[PDB]
């Protein structure tokens, strides 16, 4: 599913994002349309043979299984393919963990170089929410 802005600002917000550690909904808006533009199937292969998924382009590395890459963990305890699904659920609930391990949101490399430091409010403005 291709997300519109306003809509998967809403279904972020639903979901419990809206100020996790500290992140205000802009700033997951705007890692989703650099990581993924919105689209819930994307999928890109990594140099080291994981690859990531989703909306938030979650890699299997760490946090989901996809069967094919040898010796990564799977610390969000799900199938990579149910990333791509069209409920964002469980993308969601993977990234709170994700977010919480440390890092902030400096995992995702689009929202450290095209997020971080500008308006990310700008994400969320004209959205009924
Ligand atoms: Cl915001
Ligand atoms: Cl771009
Ligand atoms: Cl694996
Ligand atoms: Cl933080
Ligand atoms: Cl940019
Ligand atoms: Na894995």
């Not at 393919?81 to 409920?87: E, I, V, Y």
């Not at 964002?88 to 995992?107: E, F, L, P, Q, R």
Request: with cysteine.
């Amino acid at each position: 599913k291709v997300f519109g802005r306003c809509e998967l600002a809403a279904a972020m917000k639903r979901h419990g994002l809206d100020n996790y550690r500290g992140y205000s909904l802009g700033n997951w808006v705007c890692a989703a349309k650099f990581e993924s533009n919105f689209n819930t199937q994307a999928t890109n292969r990594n140099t080291d043979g994981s690859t990531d998924y989703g909306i938030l382009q979650i890699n299997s590395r760490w946090w989901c299984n996809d069967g094919r890459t040898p010796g990564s963990r799977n610390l969000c305890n799900i199938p990579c393919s149910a990333l791509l699904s069209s409920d964002i659920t469980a993308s969601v609930n993977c990234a709170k963990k994700i977010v919480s391990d440390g890092n902030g949101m400096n995992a995702w490399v689009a929202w450290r170089n095209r997020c971080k430091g500008t308006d990310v409010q700008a994400w969320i403005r004209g959205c009924r929410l």
